[PDB]
Amino acid sequence: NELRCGCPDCHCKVDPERVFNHDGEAYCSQACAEQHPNGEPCPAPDCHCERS
Ligand SMILES: [Zn+2]
Ligand SMILES: [Zn+2]
Ligand SMILES: [Zn+2]
């Protein structure tokens, strides 16, 4: 009943209509969804994820 980012390290604003689905989980952006492949940051407020 709550739509949040899949990244367990980052609390990002997820768009209910533009949500990136991955592994059955919801993501704010492709960045967190793809586990950040080549250093792609997410549109998070202050952001946290810098790993992987
Ligand atoms: Zn995110
Ligand atoms: Zn992330
Ligand atoms: Zn982030």
How do the strands and helices of this protein lay out in sequence?
Layout: E1 20-22, E2 25-27, H1 30-33
The protein binds zinc ion (3 copies).
Residues 5, 7, 10, 12, 27-29, 32, 42, 44 line the site of one zinc ion (ZN).
Short description:
It is globular and about 30 Å long.
Structure report:
Zn(2+) 3 binds at residues 5, 10, 28, 32. Belongs to the metallothionein superfamily. Keywords: Cadmium, Metal-binding, Metal-thiolate cluster, Zinc. Zn(2+) 1 binds at residues 10, 42, 47, 49. This protein is low in regular secondary structure and 52 residues long. The protein has one helix spanning 30-33, and strands at 20-22, 25-27. The protein has a two-stranded antiparallel ribbon. The longest helix is centred in the middle third of the chain and has 4 residues, at 30-33. The protein is globular and about 30 Å long. It starts with 19 loop residues before the first strand and ends in a 19-residue tail after the last helix. It binds zinc ion (ZN) (3 copies). One zinc ion binds at residues 5, 7, 10, 12, 27-29, 32, 42, 44.
N to C succession of SSEs: EEH
Structural class: little secondary structure
Radius of gyration: 10 Å
| Small molecules in complex | zinc ion
| Total domains | 1
Largest sheet, described in full?
Answer: 2 strands, antiparallel
Q: First CA to last CA: what distance?
A: 29 Å
Oligomer: monomer
Largest sheet strand order: 1-2
Q: Would you report the number of β strands?
A: 2
β-strand amount? 5-15%
Helix content: under 10%
Q: Note the total helix count.
A: 1
Overall geometry comes to: globular
GO molecular function: cadmium ion binding; zinc ion binding
Keywords: Cadmium, Metal-binding, Metal-thiolate cluster, Zinc
Family: Belongs to the metallothionein superfamily.
Protein name: Metallothionein
